[PDB]
Structures are given as C-alpha cells and as structure tokens.
Amino acid sequence: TSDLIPAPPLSKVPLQQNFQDNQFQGKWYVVGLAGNAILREDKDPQKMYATIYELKEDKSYNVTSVLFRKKKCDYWIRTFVPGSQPGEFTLGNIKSYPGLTSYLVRVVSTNYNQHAMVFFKKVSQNREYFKITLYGRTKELTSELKENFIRFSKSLGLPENHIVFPVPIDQCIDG
Ligand SMILES: O=C(O)c1cccc(O)c1O
Ligand SMILES: O=C(O)c1cccc(O)c1O
Ligand SMILES: O=C(O)c1cccc(O)c1O
Ligand SMILES: [Cl-]
Ligand SMILES: [Fe+3]
C-alpha cells in the first residue's frame, strides 16, 4: 500500500571484477544496512546479525542468517544460484516463497578478508524492494569504509534515515 523509493537502474550498481566464489565464503557480520524498507528505529535499534555463505560442490551457496529475536536464535535459510555473470545470484526454489516473483543479488566490491558491499532486489506482491549490506569479518570497520557505504547508498537515492548501523551483540551470532 505505502509508496516506495524506486529501485535504481542497475547501471548505477557496480559488479566486482573477477569474482572468486571460494574466497567470498564463510561468515560475514552485517555492520551496515540500507534499503527502501529499512528505517532507523531509535526506540528499538536494529541488532547485528550474521550471514554464512557455504559453497557447495554444484557451485551454489547454501546461505544461513542467524539473528537474535524475542530472546531466541532465528535461522533464515536459502540457496543462492550462480546468475548470468560471476558474483551475481538468482534464488533457488522461488515458487515456494509466497508472493515472490523476482529476486536478485549482486556483489558490488570486496577484498575477501576484511569487507564487502552487496546489493539485493525482490518483487513481493508486485512491490519492488532493494537493500545494500555492508559486511565485515569482524564486528568493526573503519570510518573510511563506513563513509564509503553512506556515499554509495545516497548515490542510489536513499536518504540518511534509510541507512543504519546494527549494534554489535554476543548472543547467537558468535562462534
Ligand atoms: O526475513 C528475514 O528474516 C531475513 C533475514 C536475513 C536476510 C534477509 O534478507 C531476510 O529477509
Ligand atoms: O526478504 C525476503 O522476502 C526473502 C525472500 C526469499 C528469499 C530470501 O533470501 C529473502 O531474504
Ligand atoms: O528486508 C528488506 O527490506 C529486503 C529488501 C530486499 C531484499 C531482501 O531480501 C530483503 O529482506
Ligand atoms: Cl544479508
Ligand atoms: Fe530478505
């Protein structure tokens, strides 16, 4: 029902050159998060969660995000399939998600052992949603990388109340 900031043309979202799927694997913490249905919530700040990418034999990722919610560890699980050029992905078993007609992932940049920026886009009940995650191998990143992520999001038309920085926690996400 509610109006949405439109998705940007893909022409504005870079693709990472020579993507290495082996080195992008393992666990990443979500240290920055923006998108058109992401809202700053000062009363109740978003908490850091993690996303583990596991490379399978068939070259798909099995993908698990671990979050802390209502005193418990939640697990959100899905398969990312290699898309039309390397470092992009489509969603496996799209039909089994009600309302979902379109899903897209594009890794924007990464140095594989410190940080990454990734882009996501879905159509759900004919509404078009998008987000950008700032990832780290630890729960901390520098001012430089964070201002880099604020500039890139703003370049996609997101104002600053649609850009947030999950607070580090120890429950569920560690290992
Ligand atoms: O639906 C979720 O809980 C969720 C968790 C991690 C990452 C996502 O994109 C999600 O939609
Ligand atoms: O956010 C979602 O709706 C979603 C749907 C299907 C698969 C996913 O990984 C998601 O995050
Ligand atoms: O949560 C979201 O806003 C969202 C947006 C685009 C794609 C997703 O998977 C999401 O979870
Ligand atoms: Cl994520
Ligand atoms: Fe999602």
Residue numbers in the entry: 4 to 178
In the authors' words:
The mammalian antibacterial protein siderocalin (Scn), also known as lipocalin 2 (Lcn2), neutrophil gelatinase-associated lipocalin (NGAL) or 24p3, functions by sequestering iron as bacterial siderophore complexes. Scn tightly binds a variety of bacterial siderophores including many catechol-based compounds from enteric bacteria, such as enterobactin (Ent; equilibrium dissociation constant (KD)  = 0.4±0.1 nM), but does not bind many hydroxamate-based siderophores, such as desferrioxamine (DFO). Iron transport by Scn requires the presence of a siderophore, since Scn has no measurable affinity for iron alone. The importance of Scn in antibacterial defense was demonstrated with Scn knock-out mice, which are profoundly susceptible to bacterial infections.
Since Fe(catechol)x complexes were readily observed binding in the Scn calyx by crystallography, Scn was co-crystallized in the presence of Fe(2,3-DHBA)3 and a 1∶3 mixture of iron and GA to mimic the 2,3-DHBA co-crystallization conditions. The Scn/Fe(2,3-DHBA)3 structure showed clear electron density for three 2,3-DHBA groups and bound iron in the calyx, while the Scn/Fe/GA structure showed only weak electron density features in the calyx consistent with water molecules and the unresolved side-chain of W79, despite ≥millimolar concentrations of protein and GA in the crystallization mix. For mixtures of iron and 2,3-DHBA, the Fe:L complex was predominant in solution and was successfully modeled in an association equilibrium with Scn (KD = 0.101±0.002 nM); the interaction between Scn and desferri 2,3-DHBA was more than a thousand-fold weaker (KD = 0.40±0.01 µM). At neutral pH, Ent and 2,3-DHBA chelate ferric ions in solution through the adjacent catechol 2-and 3-OH groups, generating complete, hexadentate FeEnt complexes or incomplete Fe(2,3-DHBA)x complexes. As the pH is lowered, iron binding shifts from catecholate-mode to salicylate-mode, engaging the 2-OH and carbonyl oxygens, and then to iron release. The shift from catecholate-to salicylate-mode binding is accompanied by an outward swing of the catechol groups, widening the ferric complex to a diameter that is also sterically incompatible with two of three pockets in the rigid calyx of Scn. Scn generally crystallizes at pHs in the 4 to 4.5 range. While this is below the release pH for catechol complexes, a partially-released complex was observed because of the high concentration of components and the very non-physiological conditions in the crystallization trials. Bacterial catecholate siderophores, like Ent and its substituent, 2,3-dihydroxybenzoic acid (2,3-DHBA), are unlikely to fulfill the requirements of an iron delivery pathway because iron is not released from Scn/siderophore/iron complexes (holo-Scn) until acidification below pH 4, which is not readily achieved in most cellular compartments, such as endocytic vesicles.
